[PDB]
Amino acid sequence: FISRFAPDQPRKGADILVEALERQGVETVFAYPGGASMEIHQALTRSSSIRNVLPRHEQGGVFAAEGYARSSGKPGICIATSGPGATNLVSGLADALLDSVPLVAITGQVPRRMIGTDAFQETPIVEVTRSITKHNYLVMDVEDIPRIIEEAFFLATSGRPGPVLVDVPKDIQQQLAIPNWEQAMRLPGYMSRMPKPPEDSHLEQIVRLISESKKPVLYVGGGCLNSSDELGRFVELTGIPVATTLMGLGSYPCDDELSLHMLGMHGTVYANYAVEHSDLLLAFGVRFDDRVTGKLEAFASRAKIVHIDIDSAEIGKNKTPHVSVCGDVKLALQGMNKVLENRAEELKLDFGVWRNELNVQKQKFPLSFKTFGEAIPPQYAIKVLDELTDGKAIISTGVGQHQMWAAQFYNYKKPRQWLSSGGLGAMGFGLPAAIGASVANPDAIVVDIDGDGSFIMNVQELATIRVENLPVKVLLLNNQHLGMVMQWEDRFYKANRAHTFLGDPAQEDEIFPNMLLFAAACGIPAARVTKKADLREAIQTMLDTPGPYLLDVICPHQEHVLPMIPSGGTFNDVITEGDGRI
Amino acid sequence: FISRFAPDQPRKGADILVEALERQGVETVFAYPGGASMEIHQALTRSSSIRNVLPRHEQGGVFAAEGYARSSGKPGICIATSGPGATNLVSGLADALLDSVPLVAITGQVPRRMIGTDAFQETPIVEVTRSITKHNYLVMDVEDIPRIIEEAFFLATSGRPGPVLVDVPKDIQQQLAIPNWEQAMRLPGYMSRMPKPPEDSHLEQIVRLISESKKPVLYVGGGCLNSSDELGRFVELTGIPVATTLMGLGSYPCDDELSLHMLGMHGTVYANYAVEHSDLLLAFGVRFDDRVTGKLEAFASRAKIVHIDIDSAEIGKNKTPHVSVCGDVKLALQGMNKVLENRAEELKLDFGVWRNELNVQKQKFPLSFKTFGEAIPPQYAIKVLDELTDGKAIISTGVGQHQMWAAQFYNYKKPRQWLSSGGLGAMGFGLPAAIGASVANPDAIVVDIDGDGSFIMNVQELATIRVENLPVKVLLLNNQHLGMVMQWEDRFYKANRAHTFLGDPAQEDEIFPNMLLFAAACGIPAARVTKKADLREAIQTMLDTPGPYLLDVICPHQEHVLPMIPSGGTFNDVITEGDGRI
Numbered sequence A, B: 001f002i003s004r005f006a007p008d009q010p011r012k013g014a015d016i017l018v019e020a021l022e023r024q025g026v027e028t029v030f031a032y033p034g035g036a037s038m039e040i041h042q043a044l045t046r047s048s049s050i051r052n053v054l055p056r057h058e059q060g061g062v063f064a065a066e067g068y069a070r071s072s073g074k075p076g077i078c079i080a081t082s083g084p085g086a087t088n089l090v091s092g093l094a095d096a097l098l099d100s101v102p103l104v105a106i107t108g109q110v111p112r113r114m115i116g117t118d119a120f121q122e123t124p125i126v127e128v129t130r131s132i133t134k135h136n137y138l139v140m141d142v143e144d145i146p147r148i149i150e151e152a153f154f155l156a157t158s159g160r161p162g163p164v165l166v167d168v169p170k171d172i173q174q175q176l177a178i179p180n181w182e183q184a185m186r187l188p189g190y191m192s193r194m195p196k197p198p199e200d201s202h203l204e205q206i207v208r209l210i211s212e213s214k215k216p217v218l219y220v221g222g223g224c225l226n227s228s229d230e231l232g233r234f235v236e237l238t239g240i241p242v243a244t245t246l247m248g249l250g251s252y253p254c255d256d257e258l259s260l261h262m263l264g265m266h267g268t269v270y271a272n273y274a275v276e277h278s279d280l281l282l283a284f285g286v287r288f289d290d291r292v293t294g295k296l297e298a299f300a301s302r303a304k305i306v307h308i309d310i311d312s313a314e315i316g317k318n319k320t321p322h323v324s325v326c327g328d329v330k331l332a333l334q335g336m337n338k339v340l341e342n343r344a345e346e347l348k349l350d351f352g353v354w355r356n357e358l359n360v361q362k363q364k365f366p367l368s369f370k371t372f373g374e375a376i377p378p379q380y381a382i383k384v385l386d387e388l389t390d391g392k393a394i395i396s397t398g399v400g401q402h403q404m405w406a407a408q409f410y411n412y413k414k415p416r417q418w419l420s421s422g423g424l425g426a427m428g429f430g431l432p433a434a435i436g437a438s439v440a441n442p443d444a445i446v447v448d449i450d451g452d453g454s455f456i457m458n459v460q461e462l463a464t465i466r467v468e469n470l471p472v473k474v475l476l477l478n479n480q481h482l483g484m485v486m487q488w489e490d491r492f493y494k495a496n497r498a499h500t501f502l503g504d505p506a507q508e509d510e511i512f513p514n515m516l517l518f519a520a521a522c523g524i525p526a527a528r529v530t531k532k533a534d535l536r537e538a539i540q541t542m543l544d545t546p547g548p549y550l551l552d553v554i555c556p557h558q559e560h561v562l563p564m565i566p567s568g569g570t571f572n573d574v575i576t577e578g579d580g581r582i
């Protein structure tokens, strides 16, 4: 590694911080300048290896960094000024923590002596973000910058990935020093309780339970994002069908015959059936969250549960397993795979009868949607995007009905094609996430499948897309409502509208707002599409027009995401029929 | 007060919460629905006295509630769902705390038993906001709703006003109960250390110091917002000149001859001169923040300091006064006024020589701006708005250069015409603040004087303006840069641009983005204006066109806010000359 400073040359803390990033391999940051971070931005222009993508709102910043991280496996870096800059990151940090996304957030802070005085643009950001980050730091000396940056990256990316925030006072940015890059990290506790390679004896037992089971199911989640090959081999050696969480989509190819697709509240009847009636649950890289389990006591109630997680705090948190492995699922699969190769003919594994039983459930209750006259079904639009992109696109989404449909109707072939806020479920995520995804993957088709409520929340990021010349495609499924909330109004509150309509009551049949004009404002080519017959050509135009593109897809608002298990319910409570019509 | 429920009739906690608001006199809320708050929104539609203004982002929500509060003297109410809804309020809460703005934020939360389980859309919002609110609450029983709401409003509006957050679990929203409205508040500590009416003996001493001084100065701030009459009478009885903080603008009419206008970093040379050379500083409702003092030891170094504040924690925090009054400045003025009436001829107060000395400083160093060819000076645009609105408009702003100019070049006649984020200095404030201001003041001229960086941050609120049919005028001073940061780049970093340009580098002479198309998207009439000659007619058109209007005012970017005292500097360090040209 070549520095831009002599080994004995003093330089600003800001310059040390930037080199610290270069030494971590950082190529991209998402930084919005302000008073308390000016020095860092000055240092950033001196770097020839890091590019800054300037967002139009620092919430746009974090969400972009998340998209970057989620689509690449690399940590996402965002920089903000003190005070209001720092507070604008808050939703992104919470989002990253809940979804286990590696992230380093650097915030400028007021000078050290101003801290606690209610200074200009001062927020106690470390205090504010303590419960919504994996860890955070207040840098109190320029000598500490190299160590803290190294620790921040190590913590964000190792174990269970998560966001780490580093707060950097302005006087420390300006202080001249000679950095020491040889310093030891001070993480004795964390480092000593890092998970070890799995024991053979643990892995042998799981393989034994597999051979003794007749109805096994893979319950796969976000923890498997780097194990697709290993998981592929595991399925190929066992023939166990695979159910996925929203976070796990694409770990096992959705278009494969062994795939049960997504389980949970809005999961497929067959995925949930499989789990309900399984005798062996293989929970790999999942956290048994309420969205997938429903009523805990009734979840997988007839099954031997094997749970493999890198975070011990998760093992036995909601359901207690029969068998646990605390470690990397990638290594557990690797170990199990060579045990399964060695004994393939000793084990004679055949789950054809179970696999067949599930196949009749897959035929009697497939994913389905109605088509009304010439009106566009959102589900069908996504299905066309799937066909026209050959399932190779990177998809980000907002939150709501459209998000569930993007999950249900696109066939992800690899993990890290699916970028979606799962745990927090933050609206306004898709557009800036697409931005980060596009920078991390400059040759990929990047589509933000968005809803009109979500899209508008961070619409300012359209400026970013244009200026950064990013080929972000926006498939806007426009139903004029907060669809998800509207659906619950239909099912549980007798269709009583409580502020869920996003159009103009004065001109209630006009599409409001005109999203095409938002795109026009930022010099982004855009079209509307209303008739289903016009759809295939509209999406083809979107894909073919080089650069960014917005396609406004008008959908009837009274569509419902199905199936649905009500909150805290059982598989028996599943709703498979109905909508908001008449 | 008439209820919509029988005195013995059980009803949902959500319905109790809404009635609790009606009983507090609440007429308007700013609420964005989500899963965890659906019940509250259902209850809200049942109310016939509260209107909900649906924002397009809940940051838009809080900022609107702030605008509402700041322009009316009433508390602002915003409602958000759990998780990402709650986190989106964070900047607004911090903003309200720092600027001492009364605010009640209600957030839905997950069911009580789900708390701490990493549930769907769960954030420990009480933990997150503890350091950025005056107080907060987690409601743990439906029986507590009446008490907590009463306490929240009492705390937000009494003493030093501030934001209070109430977190309300979903199961409590659904629980049936009979509310008890007679319950005693549990605030024994707070209530016992509430400031008392001022002592005569304290007030007599201040009047005595006034008579003994030859160079007195009023240093007036946000604490005087309800004391304009009292302050008017005080000045009329003493002839003491008045300097104002950014938060205090309009307490004493800016167009009066006794007015020194704004003091501080970007204050007038004469206001700062007055303070520098005063022998008696009358600090009423101010907090001696770094923006006005500079280097503390050099601030008002020759003066007897009288400090009147309602918060004891502020008295002697940064500068220690000679004399203190802990209490309401309104009452202190009332008391001092009748002492000044009784002894008017015994005191023979005449500060003409001092007042004259300041008047020559007011002539030798007035507020000034250059005009280049036919290009619009931002300062001049604001001055025209002042003339055409007769100084009667409610002005909200974003943060930066335009904010300082709006402060310097509009003559506020009453407090609560000036709505601006002072302590935190949060961008994207002006537009949603204007929204709240317009709802609180349906017959007033409401103008958001905004910058292009700030405006775009919450541009989605244009949808809100249209749908709510609010006559919000937007005077957008468009310099294509983050002007304030750009200015500091010119003065301190040799004009080295570190991500401060907001246009498109590919087409660098085109105005980007096209703000007119943002307005068009939301059906808001809009015009651009480039030549100074065209300005008076453009602004007249804006004012005359009924309903909302956006006027895009193009300004040369290299203008600088003057004067300027560098951070931690003295009156000697003041910069009165220069810009970013050549």
Ligand SMILES: CC1=C(CCOP(=O)(O)OP(=O)(O)O)S/C(=C(\C)O)N1Cc1cnc(C)nc1N
Pocket: A398, A399, A400, A401, A402, A403, A425, A426, A427, A428, A450, A451, A452, A453, A454, A455, A479, A481, A482, A483, A484, A485, B032, B033, B034, B035, B036, B081, B084, B085, B088, B121
């Ligand atoms: C408004 C809303 C939703 C509607 C999203 O509106 P959209 O129009 O963008 O999407 P669609 O559902 O019509 O397809 S879903 C939801 C949940 C699951 O809490 N919320 C509440 C919510 C509110 N605010 C934020 C930041 N995030 C949220 N999830």
Ligand SMILES: CC1=C(CCOP(=O)(O)OP(=O)(O)O)S/C(=C(\C)O)N1Cc1cnc(C)nc1N
Pocket: A032, A033, A034, A035, A036, A081, A084, A085, A088, A121, B398, B399, B400, B401, B402, B403, B425, B426, B427, B428, B450, B451, B452, B453, B454, B455, B479, B481, B482, B483, B484, B485
């Ligand atoms: C970008 C910026 C500023 C530029 C504002 O851009 P504008 O174009 O809106 O306003 P103008 O200055 O050109 O008239 S000022 C500032 C300060 C004083 O911290 N910041 C940093 C800042 C960054 N982000 C937020 C939310 N608030 C902030 N104050």
Ligand SMILES: COC(=O)c1ccccc1S(=O)(=O)NC(=O)Nc1nccc(C)n1
Pocket: A034, A035, A036, A082, A109, A110, A111, A114, A119, A120, A121, A170, A171, B290, B484, B485, B488, B567, B568
């Ligand atoms: C904004 O945080 C600060 O930088 C700060 C806060 C309180 C006191 C002193 C400072 S500073 O002197 O170190 N820097 C500063 O004030 N910067 C700054 N101040 C105003 C506008 C801009 C663009 N930058």
Ligand SMILES: COC(=O)c1ccccc1S(=O)(=O)NC(=O)Nc1nccc(C)n1
Pocket: A290, A484, A485, A488, A567, A568, B034, B035, B036, B082, B109, B110, B111, B114, B119, B120, B121, B170, B171
């Ligand atoms: C969203 O917070 C919750 O409401 C919640 C979180 C975890 C478990 C259970 C719940 S709930 O059952 O009480 N309500 C709920 O899930 N609501 C909800 N869930 C999804 C979409 C919508 C519009 N609403």
Ligand SMILES: [Mg+2]
Pocket: A451, A452, A453, A477, A478, A479, A480, A481, A482, A483
């Ligand atoms: Mg929608």
Ligand SMILES: [Mg+2]
Pocket: B451, B452, B453, B477, B478, B479, B480, B481, B482, B483
């Ligand atoms: Mg600007």
